[PDB]
């Protein structure tokens, strides 16, 4: 459990401790430098930095069109946003604020169906209510869709709360894949051959492997320690093919 929690926070949440002068200041217990490479969420923010307080659709739409202006075809501009549950409510209101500026069109009940007819014992013609905006189609083929992922709402790691409820990491919009690339843009770097060394030193008994009687003793005490270690990293080839949108209350 815990080694699956240690790897997956090292692959995703990375902090490279190489200096501006190319040095490593965090030294291990033996004396050598503890070298850390960047994670998924550090390699993705280096090109398309974007921060905000108030969400606006006009700057999400005119920046997904500035980067893919005449470089993506008309069918290749599906920008699928990963967000939280509360990031979808903030996205729902801003499309709701956008189509209220479309005064030239009127929005009927007959097409949006925000008041659907239901059957109940309370009345002869009883009504229901509720709607949501989940997709904005920009001019010239750019589409934006919502994929609410449960990863963004985890309150155990995400501790800063947003003022509108929920964790602050819920309001972060990430377009991981912009177009096709002909090679994997984001991949998980793993060493060929570096299986994790399951390693026990023990004394006269070994409670893990279940061995009574040891021919080669490390020491003389009734102990058995596990030592396991993994060398792991990730790589994002084109961080310009990935546009993010972070709340500023996470303080960058």
């Amino acid at each position: 459990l815990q080694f699956d929690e240690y790897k997956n926070n090292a692959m995703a949440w990375g902090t490279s401790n190489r200096n501006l002068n190319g040095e490593y200041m965090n030294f291990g217990k033996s004396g050598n430098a503890i070298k850390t490479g960047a994670g998924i969420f550090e390699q993705t923010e280096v090109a398309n930095t974007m921060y905000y307080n108030t969400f606006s659709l006009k700057l999400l739409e005119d920046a997904l069109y500035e980067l893919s202006a005449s470089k993506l075809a008309m069918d290749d501009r599906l920008f699928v946003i990963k967000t939280g549950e509360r990031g979808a409510i903030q996205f729902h209101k801003e499309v709701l604020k956008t189509v209220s500026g479309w005064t030239t069109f009127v929005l009927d009940n007959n097409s949006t169906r925000v008041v659907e007819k239901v059957q109940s014992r309370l009345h002869s013609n009883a009504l229901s209510a509720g709607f949501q905006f989940v997709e904005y189609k920009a001019p010239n083929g750019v589409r934006v869709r919502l994929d609410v992922d449960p990863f963004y709402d985890d309150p155990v790691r995400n501790k800063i709360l947003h003022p509108m409820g929920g964790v602050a990491f819920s309001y972060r919009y990430d377009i991981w894949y912009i177009g096709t690339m002909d090679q994997p843009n984001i991949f998980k770097c793993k060493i060929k051959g570096d299986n994790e060394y399951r390693g026990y030193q023990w004394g006269i008994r070994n409670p893990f492997t279940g061995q009574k009687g040891n021919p080669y003793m490390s020491f003389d005490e009734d102990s058995a320690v596990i030592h396991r270690m993994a060398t792991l990293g990730v790589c994002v080839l084109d961080p310009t093919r990935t546009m993010s949108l972070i709340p500023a209350i996470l303080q960058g």
Binding site: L67, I178, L237, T240, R241
Partner: protein, 35 residues
């Protein structure tokens, strides 16, 4: 309603680890010439 510099094109006169990808990477932060 304003740009921001994402690349800069200079001449050569204005200037081995393992390989992640073996081919080259065409960034989106680059203009591509048009045939």
């Amino acid at each position: 309603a304003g740009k921001l510099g994402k690349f800069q094109m200079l001449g050569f006169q204005h200037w081995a680890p393992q390989k992640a990808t073996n081919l080259m990477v065409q960034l989106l932060a680059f203009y591509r010439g048009k045939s």
